[PDB]
Design a protein around this nucleic acid. Structure first.
Ligand SMILES: [Zn+2]
Ligand SMILES: [Zn+2]
Lengths: 69, 49, 64, 115, 62, 44, 98, 304
RNA sequence: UAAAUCGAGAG
């Protein structure tokens, strides 16, 4: 749903690199590989953490019982 | 290299944030249930009432 | 005393379908500390025709 | 894993006879030990941790003048995800009889699980 | 479709001879999905702690 | 205010023998609000 | 009861013995086995984990005589300590430079 | 006759780099038993601090409480593990936690819509207040004498940009987290090393001279700083064997299939330790070697 | 507390 705190395979913290990854892809016209390299994700175990995240929580957040629409 | 797919991350997350207000993306997902939708819709509309 | 099953107890292990008598054997009990599965040696898989693809089987505890 | 069960207090009546059972507690002497997981209206707090043998909803019964609790029937501990009150499509303002209570159970991968 | 009789309770499978005499349901038996285990003596069965807590044997005190 | 309307999301407090329906709209489905209570957990 | 001697394996002479240690793995066991295999008096040394799910380790030590297995275990532990001490000293010395 | 003196004379450490999060050093003439013991102790046995228990007071967000507590347990805390002792499991939950062994964090964030949002806006920062919940929002509450000993270095997550949760107006999260001392062999959240591993030094043996244009092809089969063409005569040599992975791409060509051998210097380890943030890699390795020494000492001092 | 029938699955 939301970005994992740590890479499963090794344990490197990657939860602080999701908004940064989206911003790197968005403003700077970068490909995914270069953006991942700039974030410091070297091993592919860490690279597929942010490369393949779907970020489903946003789709969850639009259904809000506690606020009128 | 020609066997190239792509993660549409910028496209996907934007659509997550704001759903389309005109029509649903992935029109092929509506043609899967057409044999049901268009079948039920055929007993109330179409030619001959 | 209705004591718990121990390491010196025997148990009747059977896996359906029981095509031949070797598909229902008697094993010495060793109790493990971790998980909710019946752990079985690989050599027993020949007679039970058992893989570990979610296959299940029955343990019976003789009471005399 | 989510499981939603409907507790209906109107399964012991029909044809519009007087409503015998009311959600909540009464004025009898029921142990406070099961007030931990139930509010003042005999419904479970959202997010509480319910195991087997613990109350889910408390209903007072006029026929017996006794406060009875329905309990949780499962050996898998669960957390109360949500509770919904279902008023009926009736012109009369009938007291609540149907509650849809949904639990969630943590299915973390144990050995023996098919991947 | 009609109510079964006394004969219909004994005749075929799901009757009374094949379903409650030749094959019965038993006490002190567990059923579970198996997993492999080396370090088991090839004549042993590795049982979970839950089964070790539920299953019991009556030992006369001596 | 122990409950929430399932349509207009408005909070409402329901007494005994009160009509099970929202006051600001004619909706009969009410959700129990998540009140502030101590729920212990283990970060594992 | 951190380390225990298995009387079903020890010899009355004392040269052959088996030790069971709680809460160990192939971390202390491998290092201790290698360090005590450095001993010229030790004939046979091995380590074994009965079951991976139990935090139990076994060390088998058999000598050539003139030295018990317990003395061999003591020498191995001391040598492992000294080995760790020298690697610590080298690391500390190298940290000061760069 | 092997002896600690001979190993002390032959052992040598060759540090290649040193940082605040990563140390890449070398251990020479040491057995793989001791090196693997150090690696395992670094990964699994050197203690650290992480949020062990979570007490929830309200979670109206779209994330379930167990997942949120798991995430709060998975964020590394920049607190030196030496400053607190170990809790007792056999102690009752009332007096188990003291000011000397448990660090209390609190998170109280309530989302609410921003009325001044720009028209036609879709960014969840202009729209809502406290929409995103970060690890930096975990306020540290010093209780007792820890209000003084932690005054110089307050508790704060090592990576403060960790995205714990996302909120919407009306939704709120209020909770406390008790963080205790623990080791990585109990739960993976207590491991202080992002990754600890050694690799054997690659060894490229040129069996027969590869002089000429083929050397350029031979130079092409390795990472650039590994094979160099001799300046004097056109001839290949191993400039640096630490800069090549063992890819064996040279083995895929019959031209060099019989003119090279790949092996390892099987007592020369390259240790690459990447830390999580609570400790520096040099202190992590120091604690690992100290833990092995203390484990051996405790085993030695116990009656048999 | 029960029983059929239907449906979905596992080996
Ligand atoms: Zn990784
Ligand atoms: Zn309403």
């Amino acid at each position: 749903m939301i970005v994992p705190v740590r890479c499963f395979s090794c344990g490197k913290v990657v939860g602080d690199k999701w908004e940064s990854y989206l911003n790197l892809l968005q403003e700077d016209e970068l490909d995914e590989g270069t953006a991942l390299s700039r974030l410091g994700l070297k091993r592919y175990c860490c690279r597929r953490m942010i490369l393949t995240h779907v970020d489903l929580i946003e789709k969850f957040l639009r259904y809000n019982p506690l606020e009128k629409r | 290299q020609a066997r190239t797919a792509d993660f549409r991350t910028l496209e996907r997350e934007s659509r997550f944030i704001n759903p389309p207000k005109d029509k649903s993306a992935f029109p092929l997902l509506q043609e899967a249930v057409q044999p049901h939708i268009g079948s039920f819709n055929a007993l109330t509309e179409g030619p001959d009432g | 005393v209705y004591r718990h099953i121990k390491n010196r107890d025997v148990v009747l292990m059977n896996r359906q379908p029981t095509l031949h008598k070797a598909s229902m054997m008697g094993h010495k009990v060793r109790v493990l500390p971790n998980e909710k599965t019946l752990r079985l040696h690989y050599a027993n898989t020949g007679a039970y025709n058992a893989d570990f693809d979610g296959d299940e089987m029955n343990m019976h505890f003789p009471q005399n | 894993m989510y499981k939603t069960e409907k507790v209906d207090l109107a399964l012991n009546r029909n044809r519009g006879d007087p409503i015998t059972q009311h959600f909540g507690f009464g004025n009898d002497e029921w142990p406070k030990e099961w007030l931990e997981k139930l509010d003042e209206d005999g419904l479970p707090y959202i997010g509480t941790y319910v195991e087997e043998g613990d109350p889910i909803c408390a209903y007072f019964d006029d026929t017996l003048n006794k406060t009875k609790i329905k309990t949780y029937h499962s050996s898998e501990p669960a957390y109360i995800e949500e509770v919904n009150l279902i008023g009926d499509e009736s012109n009369k303002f009938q007291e609540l009889q149907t509650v849809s209570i949904k639990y969630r159970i943590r299915r973390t991968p144990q050995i023996g699980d098919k991947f | 479709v009609p109510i079964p009789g006394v004969k219909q309770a004994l005749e075929k499978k799901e009757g009374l001879f094949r379903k409650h005499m030749m094959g019965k349901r038993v006490n002190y038996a567990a059923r579970s999905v198996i997993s492999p285990d080396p370090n088991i003596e090839t004549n042993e069965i590795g049982v979970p702690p839950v089964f070790a807590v539920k299953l019991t044997y009556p030992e006369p005190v001596t | 205010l122990k409950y929430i309307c399932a349509e207009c999301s408005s909070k409402l407090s329901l007494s005994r023998t009160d009509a099970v329906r929202c006051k600001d709209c004619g909706h009969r489905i009410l959700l129990k609000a998540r009140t502030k209570r101590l729920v212990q957990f283990e970060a594992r | 009861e951190k380390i225990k001697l298995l009387t079903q394996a020890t010899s009355e002479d004392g040269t052959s013995a088996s030790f069971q240690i709680v809460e160990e793995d192939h971390t202390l066991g491998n290092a201790l086995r290698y360090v005590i295999m450095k001993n010229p008096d030790v004939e046979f040394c091995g380590y074994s984990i009965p079951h991976p799910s139990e935090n139990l380790l076994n060390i088998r030590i058999q000598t050539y005589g003139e030295t018990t297995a317990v003395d061999a275990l003591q020498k191995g532990l001391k040598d492992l300590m000294d080995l760790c001490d020298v690697v610590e000293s080298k690391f500390t010395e190298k940290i000061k430079s760069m | 006759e092997w002896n600690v003196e001979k190993f002390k004379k032959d052992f040598e450490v060759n540090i290649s780099s040193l940082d605040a999060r990563e140390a890449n050093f070398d251990l020479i003439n040491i057995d793989t038993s001791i090196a693997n013991a150090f690696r395992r102790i670094m990964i699994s046995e050197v203690p650290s601090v992480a949020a062990e228990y979570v007490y929830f007071f309200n979670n109206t967000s779209v994330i379930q409480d167990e997942v949120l507590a798991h995430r709060i347990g998975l964020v590394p805390l920049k607190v030196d593990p030496d400053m607190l002792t170990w809790v007792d499991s056999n102690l009752p939950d009332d007096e188990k936690f003291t000011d000397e062994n448990t660090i209390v964090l609190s998170l109280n964030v309530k989302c609410t819509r921003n009325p001044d949002a720009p028209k036609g806006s879709t960014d969840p920062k202009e729209l809502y207040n406290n929409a995103h919940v970060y690890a930096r929002d975990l306020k540290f509450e010093p209780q007792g004498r820890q209000s003084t000993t932690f005054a110089d270095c307050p508790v704060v997550p090592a990576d403060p940009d960790i995205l714990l949760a996302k909120l919407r107006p009306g939704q709120e999260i209020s909770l406390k987290a008790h963080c205790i001392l623990g080791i990585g062999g109990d739960h993976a959240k207590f491991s202080p090393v992002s990754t600890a591993s050694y690799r054997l030094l690659p060894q490229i043996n040129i069996l027969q001279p590869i002089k000429g244009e083929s050397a350029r092809r031979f130079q092409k089969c390795f990472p650039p700083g590994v094979i160099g063409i001799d300046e004097g005569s056109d001839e290949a040599y191993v400039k640096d064997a630490r800069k090549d992975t063992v890819s064996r791409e040279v083995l895929r060509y019959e031209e060099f299939a019989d003119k090279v051998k790949l092996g390892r210097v099987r007592n020369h380890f390259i240790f690459n330790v990447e830390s999580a943030g609570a400790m520096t890699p040099e202190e992590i390795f120091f604690k690992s070697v100290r833990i092995l020494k203390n484990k051996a000492e405790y085993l030695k001092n116990c009656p048999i």
